[PDB]
Design an enzyme around this catalytic site. Structure first.
Site, PDB file in Angstrom:
ATOM      1  N   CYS C 215      33.874  19.891  84.222  1.00 15.52           N
ATOM      2  CA  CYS C 215      34.827  20.157  83.147  1.00 15.52           C
ATOM      3  C   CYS C 215      34.128  20.562  81.852  1.00 15.52           C
ATOM      4  CB  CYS C 215      35.695  18.924  82.916  1.00 15.52           C
ATOM      5  SG  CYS C 215      34.791  17.518  82.219  1.00 15.52           S
ATOM      6  N   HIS C 263      40.221  15.888  81.030  1.00 11.27           N
ATOM      7  CA  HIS C 263      39.735  17.255  81.203  1.00 11.27           C
ATOM      8  C   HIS C 263      39.945  17.988  79.881  1.00 11.27           C
ATOM      9  CE1 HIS C 263      40.234  21.572  82.316  1.00 11.27           C
ATOM     10  NE2 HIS C 263      39.148  21.313  83.020  1.00 11.27           N
ATOM     11  N   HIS C 275      41.257  25.428  84.841  1.00 10.39           N
ATOM     12  CA  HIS C 275      40.693  24.087  84.890  1.00 10.39           C
ATOM     13  C   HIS C 275      39.694  23.985  86.033  1.00 10.39           C
ATOM     14  CE1 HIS C 275      43.449  23.038  88.287  1.00 10.39           C
ATOM     15  NE2 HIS C 275      44.215  23.914  87.661  1.00 10.39           N
TER      16      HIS C 275
END
Lengths: 227, 295, 300, 295, 225
Positions: C215, C263, C275
């Site tokens: 992330c 995240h 993502h």
């Protein structure tokens, strides 16, 4: 004027009665006058009043020469020198002989020292007071201490020769003896104030006898009696 | 004047109260003695002051930057201040002193402190003699912060606090003399209250004979007057015998050292008229007033 | 399909290790500060002890000097003296000896009081150093705890990994529909200039390798092409930067995603959110209505 | 009977003589105060005697190189030095003082080094007593400059001169105290005389009716006992005030001089049982026999 | 045991008449004897031989207890508690009241006050002083100062009441109020003596008469006036 006191009340307070009523009296110069007063009422304060010790708080006291109330530092002893006083006690001086006991009152007044020897035979051996005058007065008898006591009071012929209880502790058998000495001065005509309370003693002469009750004069008879 | 009668009448008074005639003289003598024992202490204090006042020298230090660099003042900075304050009015001689000689002179005085004091602790200075040491306050005020002077030691005035230790004992002696006097004066009043009791038989007839007020008290006064006579005599005799017994082991030690006044018997009798009149002073008027206020 | 809790607990302990390393940085700075101040206080105490020993010798010798008859009061000099000329000299030298002795004694007393105060300060410094060492041990304890639980979750994440799959998920071919355009601001143009490496990039645990990303690994690997450096902790990326608003829509920002800041993806916009996917699965582009809670957002 | 009756008559005898009976207190207070002061200075001199040397001693010293090491006299230098000086007829004996015992006597003689004064600071002495301490300065100079002797110390010859003046001050205080005491007797003897003169009536009143002799003197002795207690109380207050008023200012610097010992109020309180003994028994004795030969 | 005195030739300093030549008298319970003579009889030394104020150079003295010619000084006040003698100064304390004087006249021996005060008012009003005992004696008149010493003279048991000159220089009318006061206690039964020199009181009650002239008992008959 002459010897006269009147309106004399010192007014002694803090008492039930002051016994001072400002009595006016008039007495001449001459023979013996007797003050037959009761005890504790009018003897001591009255005798002190003409003795110039306690001043009167009302009026004034007069004598023929001086003033009693009005005075100064020098006026008091001149009055004190001219009065003779005879008391109850013998008051002799034990540390000295008899011949100079009468002379003791002469160097303290300012007299010439060698002239005392021209006076002491004229005074000491005058009337029955000769003796020997060179003995200790302690071992001498009591019947002649009062003979020199009255000799001390009469040394320069003063005006007043007042006496208070000449007999006193003396027995009555010899009181008539010393009375015979007392009347010799009375024959000279000098003023004498004789104050005592003796019944059937001085009642024989029947002279001026006075008495008071509580400061008020109650007897004034010139030939009275006591009773 | 009738003097022989007064001559022999006083003997009976001494024969009467035989247990107090000694005590009155003892207490008056003791009261006057230690009062007299302080003026000579003050006298020796001021006399020993003069034998040290004659030789006091002025001493003034200098700053370190004009003394650590050179011992002798040859720089003009120190010389200008040297030649300005040295001849004004109250000078006789000015001595300059170096630094290195001002170190070991203490060692020559005594071989102590030889290790605990460094070399760099003794500033250079001057020694000045003054005509009048009493007028020290002029050069105290004539010396302020000037370029080269660090402090002024104000000559040698360490003598006044040296001799100040005896002022306290002199003050203590004067104070206890005062309390002995206040405990002794009332006995004169007690005499007239005990003597008149012994002769009550004559004072009464001497009062009523017509005696003088000015002459009735002389036989009560002449004995109190003569009581003060031998009291100060035995007081100074006791002062002689305490000087000649307990101070020879002390005062003679400072004689060869030449440090004290060395007083003697001669000046002690010099102050006797100042004390015998004081001794007969309170004996008279107190005795006069206590008969006037009681008899 | 179900390999999501494993990925979340893998990144959670990774960010926890990152925050523990961040605390370890000020931890090592704190014990470095303790070590350098412990070098100073002991040297100061040693200097104080040296001058105290010097003044102790100084008072020893002046105590000795009085034992050899060092009479220094001044009034007692009249017993020693025999001439007035000697006496005034003795008092004159007495006034300076007593002054110097008094200054020595007062200097020793003041220096001894200062040495006692410095010894009390050194005692408080020793207490501070011992407390700092104990605190350093305490913040090393949780550090070694995170080092202990490091490999445990690595084994759990690698147990699933790319395995435990059929060929149907392999037949689900999906590199990603469309990456972002970034701040073309203008300092972040190079974020999507290297986006050909993305759309098909596999996942790695806490790595910014060219091919292996997490992330925050995508975030810093893109931002080092821009020249901007951020800490590798996406939970603290929600705590770094100014809070950017939801109303203004400019690209190149960051955005918290997948609930409670698990995240911190970059701002994508255009109804999409790129993502980080799981291990082996390529980086997908699914909109913001995939996770649920979004919370606030910051500026990188 | 009991004391509940006799409390009135002591007030009456004091009220009838408010002036004569107050002289009673303070003249006894001086007599006991001087004797209290003499004991104080004698005790202070005997206390401060222990500080210094005796009358035959020469405090010598040694160098550090033989004193910090070999504490017992074992080395060749100590054995030679402890044998050379006894060869000639000048000294009696040599002692042994080294750094083991050079500390404990130093803090005793200087009670201000209770701080960290250190060890190995006082040199070895080995002090020597001799026969004649009168021509001994040549011996001191001969020991000066010896290879191994630092210096010498001698505390005689007008150094222990204060002991020639403290005993003299105490003897002077005793000399005036005895005269004040014998003056006190011939004043306290008149107490019973003036009491019998002023109260002649009732002392005859229980005589003829029959009373015990032992109860007749009881209303006379208690006045003298109470006056004696008042005198000793005001005397012991007198020392308290006279020290703290100004005697402290002349003694406070002596402790920094460390020439005298330490004195406080407790030392004065230690002698007060001896001061209260005198004054109340001597007065009772002299009030006893004065009535046996009176009535 | 019918104790009297005899002989006693006390010459001392000068002999002359040493005390008395001889004494041949007797005592009685309730007796009342005069004595008459001149001042040179030495009657003051007669009474001083009775209270052991003068030691006899010969003979002995003994009043109902023991021969007091030889007795210790501790036992001298042992017998004095029953003897009362009266004087002319009256021995009066100006700073004390009448009840204070009567209390002081018995306080000196030492007794509990629970029985002292129980007999004080029984003899306070007996003499003639009914109350007013808390008054200063100078505030009290001179007619009762002689009665105070009489009142304090009976605080103990009356045995012998010696009297030498009780009236002194006093008016004769105010001596009648006290010549019956000792007569009242003479009716109680105790004996009482009398020493005067006037002859007016002799021919009044006709009691025992003794004469003395320089140590010589010139005439004594113990009867008549």
């Amino acid at each position: 004027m002459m010897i006269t006191l009147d309106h004399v009340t010192k007014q002694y307070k803090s008492s039930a009665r002051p016994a001072l009523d400002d009595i006016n009296v008039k007495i001449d110069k001459g023979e013996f006058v007797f003050l037959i007063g009761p005890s504790g009422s009018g003897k001591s304060t009255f005798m002190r009043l003409l003795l110039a010790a306690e001043t009167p708080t009302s009026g004034d006291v007069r004598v023929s020469k001086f003033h009693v109330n009005k005075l100064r530092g020098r006026h008091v002893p001149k009055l004190r020198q001219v009065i003779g006083c005879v008391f109850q006690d013998f008051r002799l001086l034990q540390q000295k002989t008899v011949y100079d006991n009468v002379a003791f009152a002469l160097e303290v007044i300012g007299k010439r020292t060698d002239a005392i020897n021209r006076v002491v035979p004229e005074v000491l051996e005058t009337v029955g007071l000769s003796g020997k005058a060179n003995r200790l007065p302690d071992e001498l008898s009591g019947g002649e201490q009062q003979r020199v006591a009255i000799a001390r009071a009469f040394v320069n012929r003063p005006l007043v020769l007042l006496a208070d209880e000449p007999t006193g502790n003396l027995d009555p058998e010899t009181s008539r003896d010393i009375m015979d000495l007392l009347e010799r001065i009375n024959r000279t005509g000098t003023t004498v104030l004789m104050a005592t309370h003796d019944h059937h003693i001085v009642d024989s002469m029947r002279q001026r006898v006075v008495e008071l009750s509580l400061g008020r004069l109650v007897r004034d008879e010139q030939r009275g009696v006591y009773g | 004047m009738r003097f022989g009668f007064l001559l022999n009448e006083v003997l009976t008074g001494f024969r009467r109260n035989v247990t107090m005639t000694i005590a009155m003289i003892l207490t008056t003598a003791i009261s006057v003695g230690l009062f007299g024992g302080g003026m000579l202490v003050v006298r020796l204090a001021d006399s020993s002051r003069a034998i040290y006042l004659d030789r006091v020298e002025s001493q003034v230090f200098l700053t370190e930057d004009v003394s650590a660099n050179d011992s002798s003042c040859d720089t003009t900075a120190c010389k200008a201040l040297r030649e300005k304050i040295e001849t004004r009015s109250d000078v006789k001689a000015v001595r300059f002193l170096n630094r290195q000689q001002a170190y070991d002179d203490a060692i020559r005085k005594f071989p102590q402190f030889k290790d605990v004091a460094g070399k760099d602790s003794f500033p250079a200075s001057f020694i000045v003699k003054l005509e009048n040491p009493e007028q020290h306050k002029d050069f105290d005020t004539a010396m302020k912060g000037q370029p080269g002077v660090l402090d002024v030691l104000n000559q040698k005035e360490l003598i006044d606090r040296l001799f100040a230790v005896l002022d306290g004992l002199s003050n203590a002696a004067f104070a206890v003399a005062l309390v002995q006097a206040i405990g002794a004066i009332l006995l004169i009043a007690n005499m007239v209250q005990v003597a008149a009791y012994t002769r009550r038989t004559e004072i009464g007839i001497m009062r009523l004979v017509g005696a003088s007020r000015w002459y009735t008290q002389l036989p009560f006064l002449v004995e109190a007057m003569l009581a003060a006579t031998m009291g100060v005599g035995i007081a100074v005799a006791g002062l002689m015998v305490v000087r000649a017994l307990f101070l020879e082991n002390a005062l003679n030690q400072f004689y060869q050292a030449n440090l004290i006044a060395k007083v003697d018997y001669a000046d002690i009798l010099f102050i006797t008229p100042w004390l015998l009149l004081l001794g007969v002073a309170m004996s008279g008027l107190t005795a006069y007033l206590t008969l006037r206020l009681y008899v | 399909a179900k390999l999501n809790e494993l990925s979340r607990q893998a990144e959670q302990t990774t960010e926890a290790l990152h925050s523990a390393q961040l605390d370890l940085n000020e931890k090592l700075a704190a014990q470095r500060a303790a070590d350098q101040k412990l070098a100073d206080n002991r040297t100061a105490l040693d200097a104080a002890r040296a001058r105290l020993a010097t003044f102790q010798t100084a008072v020893n010798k002046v105590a000795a000097a009085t034992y050899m008859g060092g009479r220094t009061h001044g009034m007692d000099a009249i017993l020693t003296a025999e001439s007035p000329q000697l006496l005034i000299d003795r008092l004159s030298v007495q006034r300076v000896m007593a002054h110097q002795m008094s200054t020595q004694m007062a200097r020793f007393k003041a220096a001894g009081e200062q040495a006692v105060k410095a010894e009390q300060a050194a005692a408080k410094s020793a207490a501070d150093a011992r407390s700092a060492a104990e605190q350093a041990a305490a913040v090393r304890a949780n550090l070694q705890h995170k080092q202990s639980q490091l490999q445990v979750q690595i084994a759990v994440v690698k147990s699933q990994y790319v395995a435990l799959t059929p060929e149907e998920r392999t037949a689900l071919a999906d590199p990603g529909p469309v990456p972002a355009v970034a701040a073309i601001g203008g300092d972040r143009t190079a974020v999507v200039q290297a986006a050909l490496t993305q759309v098909g990039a596999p996942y790695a645990w806490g790595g910014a390798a060219p091919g292996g990303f997490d992330c925050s690994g995508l975030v810093m690997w893109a931002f080092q092409q821009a020249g901007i450096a951020l800490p590798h902790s996406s939970q603290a990326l929600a705590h770094g930067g100014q809070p950017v608003a939801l109303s203004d829509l400019q690209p190149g920002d960051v955005l918290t995603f997948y609930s409670d800041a698990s995240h911190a993806g970059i701002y994508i916009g255009d109804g999409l959110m790129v993502h980080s996917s799981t291990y082996g699965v390529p980086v997908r582009v699914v909109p913001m209505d995939s996770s649920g809670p979004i919370y606030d957002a910051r500026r990188y």
